[PDB]
Amino acid sequence: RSRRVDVMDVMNRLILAMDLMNRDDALRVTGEVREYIDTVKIGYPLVLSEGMDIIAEFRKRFGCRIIADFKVADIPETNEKICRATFKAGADAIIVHGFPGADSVRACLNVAEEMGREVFLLTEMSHPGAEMFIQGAADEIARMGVDLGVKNYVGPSTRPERLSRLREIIGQDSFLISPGETLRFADAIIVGRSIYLADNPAAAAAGIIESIK
Amino acid sequence: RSRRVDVMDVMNRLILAMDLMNRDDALRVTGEVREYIDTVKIGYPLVLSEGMDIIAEFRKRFGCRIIADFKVADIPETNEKICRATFKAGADAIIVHGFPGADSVRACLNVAEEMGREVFLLTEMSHPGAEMFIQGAADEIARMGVDLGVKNYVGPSTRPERLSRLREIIGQDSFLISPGETLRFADAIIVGRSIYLADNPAAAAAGIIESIK
Ligand SMILES: O=c1cc(O)ccn1[C@@H]1O[C@H](COP(=O)(O)O)[C@@H](O)[C@H]1O
Ligand SMILES: O=c1cc(O)ccn1[C@@H]1O[C@H](COP(=O)(O)O)[C@@H](O)[C@H]1O
Numbered sequence: 001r002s003r004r005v006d007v008m009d010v011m012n013r014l015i016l017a018m019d020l021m022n023r024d025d026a027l028r029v030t031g032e033v034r035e036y037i038d039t040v041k042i043g044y045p046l047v048l049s050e051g052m053d054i055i056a057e058f059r060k061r062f063g064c065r066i067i068a069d070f071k072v073a074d075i076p077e078t079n080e081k082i083c084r085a086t087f088k089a090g091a092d093a094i095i096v097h098g099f100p101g102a103d104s105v106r107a108c109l110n111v112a113e114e115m116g117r118e119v120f121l122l123t124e125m126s127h128p129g130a131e132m133f134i135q136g137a138a139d140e141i142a143r144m145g146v147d148l149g150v151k152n153y154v155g156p157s158t159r160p161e162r163l164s165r166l167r168e169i170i171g172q173d174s175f176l177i178s179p180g181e182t183l184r185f186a187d188a189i190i191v192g193r194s195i196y197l198a199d200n201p202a203a204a205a206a207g208i209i210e211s212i213k
Numbered sequence: 214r215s216r217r218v219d220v221m222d223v224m225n226r227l228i229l230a231m232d233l234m235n236r237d238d239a240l241r242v243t244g245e246v247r248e249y250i251d252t253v254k255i256g257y258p259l260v261l262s263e264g265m266d267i268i269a270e271f272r273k274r275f276g277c278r279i280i281a282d283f284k285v286a287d288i289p290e291t292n293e294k295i296c297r298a299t300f301k302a303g304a305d306a307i308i309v310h311g312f313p314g315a316d317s318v319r320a321c322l323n324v325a326e327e328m329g330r331e332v333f334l335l336t337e338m339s340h341p342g343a344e345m346f347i348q349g350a351a352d353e354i355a356r357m358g359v360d361l362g363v364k365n366y367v368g369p370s371t372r373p374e375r376l377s378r379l380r381e382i383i384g385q386d387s388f389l390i391s392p393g394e395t396l397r398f399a400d401a402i403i404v405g406r407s408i409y410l411a412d413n414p415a416a417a418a419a420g421i422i423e424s425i426k
């Protein structure tokens with residue numbers, strides 16, 4: 001897939017999922033791979049452990065793009081506050097759930113347009129429990145995103161034919177990230193433990209990127 | 214409803230939803246109503262603005278029970294970390310979504326079992342967008358809770374016949390909280406802005422409590 005001008009550029013199509021819960025270890029690994037990766041996904045395990053100030057630290061130290069994987073899933077008024085606080089902290093983008101419906105997603109889009117940031121709609125998840133409710137809703141949530149002007153999506157890499165279906169719904173231009181055949185549909189992949197648990201994170205990141213070639 | 218010995222006692226059946234985003238205002242209001250309320254629900258708007266350390270502060274200053282309304286909705290491994298960090302910070306209980314499925318919920322229950330804390334399963338939400346996916350899943354999510362040994366639930370107060378339905382699924386002993394006759398089905402109500410935006414919060418809390426007679 002070629003880059004679309006109107007959506008974000010992720011260096012080497014590789015997003016680091018930084019789910020270490022200790023500030024020292026998180027900063028060490030991220031600094032090590034900065035020459036390979038410019039986009040870092042940070043979630044609640046790190047921010048609840050170390051504080052939201054860690055976002056600004058990642059930005060001041062590494063100048064990386066930060067996606068807050070907060071899976072926002074509240075009522076509209078609350079979603080607005082969560083997004084505002086998160087963007088105020090310096091996040092470039094936030095991941096939101098679609099299951100709570102269109103108004104809850106729109107609340108996030110509103111704050112993001114006010115503040116000049118981005119919203120990623122999470123369409124589907126990879127874990128077994130996702131079969132119970134999320135799987136059956138995934139296509140409709142994706143279509144809802146399209147009808148909300150959403151331009152950034154998250155989908156699972158485990159079942160590639162699901163990404164093909166997703167890509168059919170969202171169209172060829174929207175930005176899609178996913179936690180080889182994956183990159184025929186997604187614009188970037190998300191990798192955590194294979195990098196941040198390796199003895200040489202920079203080598204792990206380099207190896208993955210060589211495969212992408 | 215009479216109190217069940219095996220579930221939590223909420224003073225006056227009134228939970229304060231503290232969604233102010235400034236530490237000073239949040240602490241002021243909570244201290245003022247402590248003689249009326251012993252259980253406070255804190256969500257991401259406050260903790261992302263002020264830090265997770267705010268939880269220990271509420272506890273050390275007021276000795277109130279803290280419910281973290283974090284609407285946990287990630288994959289199982291991530292849910293585990295979020296719950297661990299949240300309980301480590303001192304929360305007595307956490308609210309989790311059921312739509313990501315049974316394994317995601319059980320992950321939270323496992324940590325709560327380990328750490329001696331409680332999980333509230335959110336069955337349904339009250340905003341209009343909840344009609345799209347959540348409403349249709351609500352009964353199945355409640356039944357899922359029953360089959361996960363869940364003893365604490367959250368349901369909407371706006372449609373009372375929905376609480377009666379919920380109560381039929383979860384049985385007469387499980388603990389149910391809901392954001393008058395609401396208390397025929399729920400064990401406590403959750404009130405935010407009517408208390409924390411009033412000129413005299415202690416008076417607003419008193420007025421609501423008098424209605425509970
Ligand atoms: O958000 C999703 C949705 C999925 O379907 C799968 C993983 N994830 C997230 O992606 C990340 C994957 O990290 P890894 O499994 O260590 O490579 C982690 O933060 C996990 O919570
Ligand atoms: O968790 C739910 C689920 C609902 O269906 C409705 C409100 N809530 C939460 O309950 C709280 C209600 O606060 P209030 O509307 O100010 O009274 C607030 O934190 C809101 O996010």
Ligand SMILES: [Ca+2]
Nearest residue numbers: 004005007008
């Ligand atoms: Ca681009």
Ligand SMILES: [Ca+2]
Nearest residue numbers: 217218220221
């Ligand atoms: Ca009791």
